[PDB]
Amino acid sequence: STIEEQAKTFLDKFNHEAEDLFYQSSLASWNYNTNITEENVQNMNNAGDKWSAFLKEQSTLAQMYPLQEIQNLTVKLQLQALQQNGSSVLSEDKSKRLNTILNTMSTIYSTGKVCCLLLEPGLNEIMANSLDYNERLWAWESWRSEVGKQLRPLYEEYVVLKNEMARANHYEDYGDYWRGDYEVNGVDGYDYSRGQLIEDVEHTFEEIKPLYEHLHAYVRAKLMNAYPSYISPIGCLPAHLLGDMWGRFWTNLYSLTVPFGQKPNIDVTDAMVDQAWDAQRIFKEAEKFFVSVGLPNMTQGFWENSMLTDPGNVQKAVCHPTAWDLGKGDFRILMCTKVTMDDFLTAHHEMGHIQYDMAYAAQPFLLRNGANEGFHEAVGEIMSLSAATPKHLKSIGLLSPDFQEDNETEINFLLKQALTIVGTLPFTYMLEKWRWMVFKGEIPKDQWMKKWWEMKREIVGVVEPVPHDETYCDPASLFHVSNDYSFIRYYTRTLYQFQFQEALCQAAKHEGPLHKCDISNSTEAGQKLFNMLRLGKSEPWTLALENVVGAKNMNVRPLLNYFEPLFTWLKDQNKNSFVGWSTDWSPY
Amino acid sequence: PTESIVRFPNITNLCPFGEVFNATRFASVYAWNRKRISNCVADYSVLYNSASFSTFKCYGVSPTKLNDLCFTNVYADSFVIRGDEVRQIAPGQTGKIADYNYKLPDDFTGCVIAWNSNNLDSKVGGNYNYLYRLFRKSNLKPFERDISTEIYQAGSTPCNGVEGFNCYFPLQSYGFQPTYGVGYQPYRVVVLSFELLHAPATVCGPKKSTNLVKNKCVNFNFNGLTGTGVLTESDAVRDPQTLEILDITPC
Numbered sequence: 001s002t003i004e005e006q007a008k009t010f011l012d013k014f015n016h017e018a019e020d021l022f023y024q025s026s027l028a029s030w031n032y033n034t035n036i037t038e039e040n041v042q043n044m045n046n047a048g049d050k051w052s053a054f055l056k057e058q059s060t061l062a063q064m065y066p067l068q069e070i071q072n073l074t075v076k077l078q079l080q081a082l083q084q085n086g087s088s089v090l091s092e093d094k095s096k097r098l099n100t101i102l103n104t105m106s107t108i109y110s111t112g113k114v115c116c117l118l119l120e121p122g123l124n125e126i127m128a129n130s131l132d133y134n135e136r137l138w139a140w141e142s143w144r145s146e147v148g149k150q151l152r153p154l155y156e157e158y159v160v161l162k163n164e165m166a167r168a169n170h171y172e173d174y175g176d177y178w179r180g181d182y183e184v185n186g187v188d189g190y191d192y193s194r195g196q197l198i199e200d201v202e203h204t205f206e207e208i209k210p211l212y213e214h215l216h217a218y219v220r221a222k223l224m225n226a227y228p229s230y231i232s233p234i235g236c237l238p239a240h241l242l243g244d245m246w247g248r249f250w251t252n253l254y255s256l257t258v259p260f261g262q263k264p265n266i267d268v269t270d271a272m273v274d275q276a277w278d279a280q281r282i283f284k285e286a287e288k289f290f291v292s293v294g295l296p297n298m299t300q301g302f303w304e305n306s307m308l309t310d311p312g313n314v315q316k317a318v319c320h321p322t323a324w325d326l327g328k329g330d331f332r333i334l335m336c337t338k339v340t341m342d343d344f345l346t347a348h349h350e351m352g353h354i355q356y357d358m359a360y361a362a363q364p365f366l367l368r369n370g371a372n373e374g375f376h377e378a379v380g381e382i383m384s385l386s387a388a389t390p391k392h393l394k395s396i397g398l399l400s401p402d403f404q405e406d407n408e409t410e411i412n413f414l415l416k417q418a419l420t421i422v423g424t425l426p427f428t429y430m431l432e433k434w435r436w437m438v439f440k441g442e443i444p445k446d447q448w449m450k451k452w453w454e455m456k457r458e459i460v461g462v463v464e465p466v467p468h469d470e471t472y473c474d475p476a477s478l479f480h481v482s483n484d485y486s487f488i489r490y491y492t493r494t495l496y497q498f499q500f501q502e503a504l505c506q507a508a509k510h511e512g513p514l515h516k517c518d519i520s521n522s523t524e525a526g527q528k529l530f531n532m533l534r535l536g537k538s539e540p541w542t543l544a545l546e547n548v549v550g551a552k553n554m555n556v557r558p559l560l561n562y563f564e565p566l567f568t569w570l571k572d573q574n575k576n577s578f579v580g581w582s583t584d585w586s587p588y
Numbered sequence: 589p590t591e592s593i594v595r596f597p598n599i600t601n602l603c604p605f606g607e608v609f610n611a612t613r614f615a616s617v618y619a620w621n622r623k624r625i626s627n628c629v630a631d632y633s634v635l636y637n638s639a640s641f642s643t644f645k646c647y648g649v650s651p652t653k654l655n656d657l658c659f660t661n662v663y664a665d666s667f668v669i670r671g672d673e674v675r676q677i678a679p680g681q682t683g684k685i686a687d688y689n690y691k692l693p694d695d696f697t698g699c700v701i702a703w704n705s706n707n708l709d710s711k712v713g714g715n716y717n718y719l720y721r722l723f724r725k726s727n728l729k730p731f732e733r734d735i736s737t738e739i740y741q742a743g744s745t746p747c748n749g750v751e752g753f754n755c756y757f758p759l760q761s762y763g764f765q766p767t768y769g770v771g772y773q774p775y776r777v778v779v780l781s782f783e784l785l786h787a788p789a790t791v792c793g794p795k796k797s798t799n800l801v802k803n804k805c806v807n808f809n810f811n812g813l814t815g816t817g818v819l820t821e822s823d824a825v826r827d828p829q830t831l832e833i834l835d836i837t838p839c
């Protein structure tokens with residue numbers, strides 16, 4: 001019969017037994033994670049190999065059906081996802097070499113000694129709490145020299161092999177292959193292109209340049225008080241003084257730069273301990289939040305299957321917080337819950353991931369995912385934004401019934417959150433731009449480090465303390481770069497997060513600033529959210545974005561509207577100090 | 589209307605509903621098992637009030653009235669399905685179960701009973717003894733049973749009984765584990781169909797028969813049909829206990 005009908009029959013055969021193999025492998029992984037031992041590793045590896053072999057065989061079988069004949073725009077989506085030939089185009093020797101390179105990179109990064117003083121916690125504590133110039137410089141340079149120097153030729157060979165593999169799949173470069181996620185075709189008025197994402201990021205970054213400039217000037221002025229003779233008024237911040245090994249986040253800088261240090265922050269750890277919360281009541285409160293918004297209950301097996309506290313001394317378990325979607329109606333949470341505010345907020349976040357997983361469970365197997373890579377963390381995170389407000393903590397009995405808030409605490413909270421939200425956008429943008437240019441071939445192999453540090457000086461405003469020759473490979477030191485991970489998800493996550501928060505806050509009829517806003521007891525906000533949640537990947541991410549915000553493309557205006565009082569206060573504070581930086585000045 | 593007389597056939601045989609409801613193993617949905625029950629008095633009140641059934645829906649008969657009636661035959665069809673497909677066992681529905689496995693006519697006259705069975709037939713590691721038909725050439729006429737395992741062909745080229753490209757095995761196996769969701773947990777289903785004909789009734793509800801009277805206007809109830817009028821030995825009802833034809837004259 002027609003190719004459409006054969007494709008439909010093939011997909012109906014695949015979805016069954018795909019769900020089965022996926023459930024078995026996921027259950028094996030959960031058994032290993034909750035109970036680590038020698039025997040469980042063999043089950044985990046066996047199930048993983050079985051699932052991988054099944055997926056490869058089904059891809060080879062699905063290669064037969066030509067994609068032009070199908071005209072359903074859902075069967076076509078599932079076929080497009082399934083015919084992802086990918087890395088198998090490489091020769092057997094080339095594939096072996098590529099896997100060897102990746103494994104060597106992961107091995108060398110995982111075990112790195114600068115002595116004895118491993119990366120964690122030996123070097124993180126030095127880089128986060130030393131407060132001494134010489135110690136921080138020594139740790140920074142030693143880690144660079146020990147790790148990044150050894151990864152130069154491996155990274156060069158990785159670049160050439162990955163570029164050739166990506167060109168083999170009818171793509172221009174490997175960067176284009178990465179950007180292929182943000183691409184929707186075939187729908188009139190909703191289409192998008194990979195060449196559109198190279199722009200629409202430069203534009204939004206040009207919009208937030210002044211806010212970052214003011215924050216950078218304020219931090220440098222407040223930081224010259226310490227380190228008196230090593231910072232210049234006009235110039236860049238030295239690279240190792242950013243409170244991290246790479247300067248990805250500025251959170252550790254908070255203790256140095258507080259606007260009003262007299263006022264303590266809101267902290268309810270002692271309130272929790274006084275009432276003796278039992279590490280299960282936290283998830284009860286999270287469920288109460290999500291019910292009051294208008295979203296459904298939790299499944300009956302969630303409470304009995306999942307483990308929500310450390311198993312004990314006899315049974316060892318890795319418990320990095322995680323939300324598990326095992327399939328077949330099975331949802332679980334892996335957390336070592338303690339009575340602290342951070343655990344309360346992260347319980348809210350993971351519960352949000354689970355609530356996202358329940359929505360599109362009715363969709364076929366290939367379409368059970370977020371609309372793109374940024375939609376899923378943003379939905380997870382707006383829940384924590386709503387749960388952190390003083391109003392919400394006041395409604396529960398843990399915060400004091402008679403609490404009076406002054407604008408000093410508003411400024412402290414806004415600055416604390418801004419050192420993390422808008423402090424990492426320039427770094428993400430610069431890193432991904434450098435990787436895109438390297439893969440494209442614009443930067444020759446002899447000019448990698450010069451262009452990297454020129455971009456660091458020009459875009460981020462961060463200057464290196466000691467010069468680096470072409471033997472060094474600084475970007476390869478980061479976990480994501482050497483271990484083959486995409487990085488543009490963290491740029492778009494914040495933008496989507498703030499757009500969703502503004503839409504949900506305006507739908508719930510809130511008045512005043514955006515950062516005091518709360519969406520509990522609002523059924524219409526929950527219904528608007530659930531309309532987008534239930535789509536899964538079936539509809540283009542532009543349409544899923546329109547169903548909540550009302551705009552097709554991502555916008556940065558709500559991010560600035562969130563940070564407006566902080567911006568006004570910063571302008572007032574920096575009316576006297578210099579704003580901007582000079583590229584010429586260097587520490588040496 | 590001086591008196592009221594009711595006459596049902598004398599049956600003292602308790603009806604074997606335990607052999608159907610309480611069974612060691614239930615059959616797969618694709619090949620269900622049918623049991624005929626007759627010459628029995630059926631107490632439908634305990635069946636309704638057992639209160640352990642997830643679904644108890646009667647179509648075309650009031651659930652309380654059917655306690656006291658007479659039927660020519662009763663058929664009971666039992667199987668095991670998934671939690672989410674119990675809604676497909678009802679007239680006019682469509683899906684994987686209704687199209688190819690168990691199709692009910694539109695003019696249904698019976699009760700569908702379904703209860704959770706996750707304790708009995710679901711174990712860790714999977715229970716692959718319960719199958720269901722997935723591909724079929726055409727839909728099923730009401731109350732039709734197919735047990736064939738012929739290779740289903742979707743493409744143009746025939747395949748000589750071997751799996752491969754465009755050839756599939758029709759039956760696919762339910763996988764049952766105790767950790768599954770409620771939607772995927774097993775459910776045991778029993779469908780009762782009440783058949784009426786002109787033949788003498790055999791299955792009847794519990795009621796005590798009384799002596800008959802003649803030449804007086806009394807209310808009569810024979811085999812579930814009720815009327816009023818003088819009964820005269822010979823618009824004419826054959827009482828079941830003695831097989832005498834009686835004339836009904838309005839009073």
Ligand SMILES: *[C@@H]1O[C@H](CO)[C@@H](O)[C@H](O)[C@H]1NC(C)=O
Pocket residue numbers: 035037039315
């Ligand atoms: C963890 O695995 C060990 C395997 O030696 C087993 O003895 C133990 O019972 C497991 N813990 C459980 C099932 O809670």
Ligand SMILES: *[C@@H]1O[C@H](CO)[C@@H](O)[C@H](O)[C@H]1NC(C)=O
Pocket residue numbers: 008072074075
């Ligand atoms: C595509 O096929 C599905 C069933 O597989 C159907 O529900 C849907 O309506 C079809 N799409 C269009 C546009 O007809």
Ligand SMILES: *[C@@H]1O[C@H](CO)[C@@H](O)[C@H](O)[C@H]1NC(C)=O
Pocket residue numbers: 083084085086089168169170
């Ligand atoms: C997979 O390999 C085949 C080799 O014949 C090639 O034609 C096909 O385009 C590849 N799939 C891709 C690139 O998605």
Ligand SMILES: *[C@@H]1O[C@H](CO)[C@@H](O)[C@H](O)[C@H]1NC(C)=O
Pocket residue numbers: 291297298
């Ligand atoms: C479902 O949510 C409602 C809303 O408050 C609650 O009353 C009920 O107990 C919940 N049921 C389950 C099984 O979670």
Ligand SMILES: *[C@@H]1O[C@H](CO)[C@@H](O)[C@H](O)[C@H]1NC(C)=O
Pocket residue numbers: 407408
């Ligand atoms: C905000 O805080 C500052 C801190 O000094 C205070 O002077 C001012 O009165 C507060 N309110 C406004 C509206 O500025």
Ligand SMILES: *[C@@H]1O[C@H](CO)[C@@H](O)[C@H](O)[C@H]1NC(C)=O
Pocket residue numbers: 292391392395518520521
């Ligand atoms: C939400 O509704 C509950 C229901 O009584 C109430 O206790 C709580 O104060 C409300 N909170 C907000 C923020 O409306």
Ligand SMILES: *[C@@H]1O[C@H](CO)[C@@H](O)[C@H](O)[C@H]1NC(C)=O
Pocket residue numbers: 605606609610638
């Ligand atoms: C079936 O077993 C239950 C459990 O013992 C019992 O109560 C019931 O009378 C039995 N028969 C029927 C028809 O349910």
Ligand SMILES: *[C@@H]1O[C@H](CO)[C@@H](O)[C@H](O)[C@H]1NC(C)=O
Pocket residue numbers: 598828829830
């Ligand atoms: C029951 O009905 C039959 C009908 O033929 C009759 O012969 C019999 O006398 C009645 N009574 C008993 C106790 O069987």
Ligand SMILES: [Zn+2]
Pocket residue numbers: 349353377380
């Ligand atoms: Zn998350």
